[PDB]
């Protein structure tokens, strides 16, 4: 396929090794990525920790600071850094105003954290799942218990924690070795119902879709991807949550195969992000394959290899219209749909008029005026 006909736009946002980052820190624990605004690299040199903040939105400007903690993340959009020492001491600072937003010491160590929203930080301990309203102004208030972890996440490495926009549905993802492969486990929690459900999956996200009949009111869907560690079968599922009975149109569950080539036995999904505006799911594998699916139908649009070096983390890109990731060589890579080519691609390469109409209509995209 000629490059001008690709339905995606690919960009290298930065090469971290060009900024002087050492490859020994390019790993899931040390180089963190909450959004395409920033990359935070925790460095240790002669026994002393530091953080390098790379501002991808400002020409890859690097801000370096010494720190006493051993784990650090940036906010999705603001110059707010969250630092912890050995899971127990936690401090969150606005680097602009210099002000301390949160400062507390946990009795039970935090072992994973992730921004759930612009206002809310999620914490997972050995036993518990918590959230903090970081910007509530009460500096010493500890995170609030959301729920206990489900036993299905026992013995997993926690790799993600996501929520819906209403902050009343949540998913925690962990991985473990099983049958010589990596299996994924997900705890889904409804805050309104105070109920958890254990499911199999490597990736998860909550999103919204506008359906015919429903005016401008979206319906909510949960998107999950899985590779079965016994059978090797890959599956994407999209399922409605909390249907508003006032709305005439419901989202019928969709299931789609996730393709794995024959020599990719040990590959699995590592990230999923969604463009709400365009209704496009972007699913990335550990080995660097990107898979696009249309959100309404679950149709697999496109599969391509964006990197040969393994991906270790990912985040939304371009106001959550795409996906960005970091590979083991320190390249920060981004994919979003080509607004000029996606509809022609569906029409001409997939020969799918109905799907072309769906995508064109939802996104206000060119290429479908003659249908």
């Amino acid at each position: 396929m000629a490059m001008s006909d690709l339905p995606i736009e690919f960009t290298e946002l930065v090469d971290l090794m060009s900024l002087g980052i050492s490859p020994q820190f390019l790993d899931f624990r040390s180089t963190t990525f909450e959004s395409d605004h920033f990359v935070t690299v925790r460095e240790t040199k002669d026994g002393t920790n530091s953080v390098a903040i790379v501002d991808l939105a400002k020409g890859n400007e690097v801000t370096r600071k010494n720190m006493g903690g051993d784990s650090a993340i940036m906010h999705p959009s603001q110059m707010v850094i969250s630092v912890r020492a050995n899971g127990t001491i936690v401090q969150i600072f606005n680097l602009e105003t210099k002000s301390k937003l949160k400062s507390f010491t946990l009795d039970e160590p935090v072992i994973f954290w992730r921004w759930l929203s612009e206002t809310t930080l999620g914490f997972v301990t050995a036993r518990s799942i918590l959230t903090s309203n970081v910007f509530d102004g009460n500096v010493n208030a500890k995170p609030q218990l959301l729920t206990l972890r489900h036993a299905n996440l026992n013995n997993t490495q926690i790799i993600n924690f996501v929520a819906n926009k209403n902050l009343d549905w949540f998913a925690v993802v962990g991985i473990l070795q099983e049958n010589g492969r990596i299996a994924g486990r997900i705890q889904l929690f409804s805050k309104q119902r105070n109920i958890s459900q254990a499911i199999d999956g490597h990736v998860a996200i909550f999103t919204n879709i506008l359906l015919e009949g429903n005016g401008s009111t979206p319906v909510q869907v949960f998107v999950t991807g899985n590779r079965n560690a016994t059978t090797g079968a890959g599956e994407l599922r999209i399922i409605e949550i909390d249907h508003d009975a006032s709305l005439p149109s419901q989202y019928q569950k969709e299931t789609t195969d996730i393709f794995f080539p024959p020599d990719a036995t040990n590959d699995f999904p590592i990230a999923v992000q969604v463009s709400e505006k365009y209704g496009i799911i972007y699913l990335l594998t550990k080995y660097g394959f990107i898979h696009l699916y249309e959100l309404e139908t679950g149709t697999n649009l496109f599969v391509n290899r964006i990197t040969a070096e393994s991906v270790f983390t990912a985040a939304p890109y371009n106001h959550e219209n795409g996906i960005a990731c970091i590979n083991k060589k320190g390249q920060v890579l981004a994919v979003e749909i080509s607004t000029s080519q996606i509809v022609p691609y569906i029409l001409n390469k997939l020969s799918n008029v109905a799907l072309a109409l769906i995508v064109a209509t939802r996104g206000g995209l060119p290429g479908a005026d003659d249908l």
């Binding site: 889904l188 409804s190 119902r193 109920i195 958890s196 459900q197 499911i199 949960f222 999950t224 599922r237 399922i239 949550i241 569950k253």
Partner: peptide, 7 residues
């Protein structure tokens, strides 16, 4: 309790 989702 029912499943939250059909999965």
């Amino acid at each position: 309790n029912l499943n939250l989702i059909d999965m």
